[PDB]
């Protein structure tokens, strides 16, 4: 899914979340917290999914906020 | 008659003028000496604590 950059961001998030999910069931909590700390600090969203998503285009423009063209008379 | 350059730090953001609404009123703590405090008009986006570089250092505006 997504496309070329889209994919990169997803895989990196999956990996860091992965590592933390793993320290949460097998290792100890302080370690995983240490990791969420380093990520969350410097970050990039690594452990939290960015919301931002397509807005729907509305008749009268070919984009969502873009409105066609007018000449008046 | 004159030249110098003055550093001044934003104390309190007053509100907005220009009929277009694009100049922001400001109150400035005079940086090199705090015992000064004056009102200056701004082009850009300004927020408390950041710094102006005053040419004129008297003047002290109002509307326009």
């Amino acid at each position: 899914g997504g496309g070329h950059v889209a994919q990169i961001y997803a895989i990196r998030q999956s990996i860091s979340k992965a590592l933390v999910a793993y320290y949460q069931k097998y290792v100890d909590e302080a370690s995983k917290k240490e990791i969420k700390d380093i990520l969350i600090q410097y970050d990039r969203t690594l452990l939290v999914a960015d919301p931002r998503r397509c807005e729907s285009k509305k008749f009268g423009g070919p984009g969502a906020r873009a409105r066609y063209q007018k000449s008046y008379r | 008659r004159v030249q110098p350059i003055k550093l001044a730090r934003v104390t309190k953001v007053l509100g907005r003028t220009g009929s277009q609404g694009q100049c922001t009123q400001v109150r400035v703590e005079f940086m090199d000496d705090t015992s000064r405090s004056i009102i200056r008009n701004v082009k850009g986006p300004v927020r408390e604590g950041d710094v102006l570089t005053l040419l004129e250092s008297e003047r002290e505006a109002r509307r326009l």
Binding site: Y42 | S19, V51, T53
Partner: protein
């Protein structure tokens, strides 16, 4: 990567915004070092937030201009990474420091606004905010590099390096430096 969070490979630490006030909408990383001039980046919602954005990325974004070039960040990131390398070859240093310097040096301190003035509308000398100083500078340099690069053999990365270097120590060779002095000169009259 684990020792210190360098840039493509450049250190954030030890770069100092040599200019009080500007300090701080130029965002290096009073902790924020990253790796790449690309991010999901939500800057738009708030008025200020943009300041948070790393200046490098801010510069990279301004790079992708002109209808055709819109949205080509990968291209800009590529250009930016190259430019830093050219700058480094040209003076050692941190090219990022070089970048910051050009930005500090270019923001018009004073400017002019078109005050109504009755008739023969005169223009009022006003001082310029630091956000504007940063915003304006990055334009100037980008417009400078882009304008130069267009009919010449030389690449944007190169023209960018040239604009950045000349500006870092304000050579006035630069388009941007000449523009800033022009805007400021205008500010002073009017008053």
């Amino acid at each position: 990567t684990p020792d210190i969070k360098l840039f493509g490979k450049w250190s954030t630490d030890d770069v100092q915004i040599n200019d009080i006030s500007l300090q701080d909408y130029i965002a290096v990383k009073e902790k924020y070092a990253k790796y790449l001039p690309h991010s999901a980046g939500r800057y738009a919602a708030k008025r200020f937030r943009k300041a948070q954005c790393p200046i490098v990325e801010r510069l990279t974004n301004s790079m992708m201009m002109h209808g055709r070039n819109n949205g080509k960040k990968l291209m800009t990131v590529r250009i930016v990474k190259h430019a830093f390398e050219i700058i480094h070859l040209l003076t050692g240093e941190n090219p990022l420091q070089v970048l910051v310097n050009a930005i500090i040096n270019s923001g018009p301190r004073e400017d002019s606004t078109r005050i109504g003035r009755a008739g023969t509308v005169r223009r009022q000398a006003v001082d310029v905010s630091p956000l504007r100083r940063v915003n304006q500078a990055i334009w100037l340099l980008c417009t400078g590099a882009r304008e130069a690069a267009f009919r010449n053999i030389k690449t944007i990365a190169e023209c960018l390096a040239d604009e950045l270097i000349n500006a870092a120590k304000g050579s006035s060779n630069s388009y941007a430096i000449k523009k800033k002095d022009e805007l400021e000169r205008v500010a002073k009259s009017n008053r």
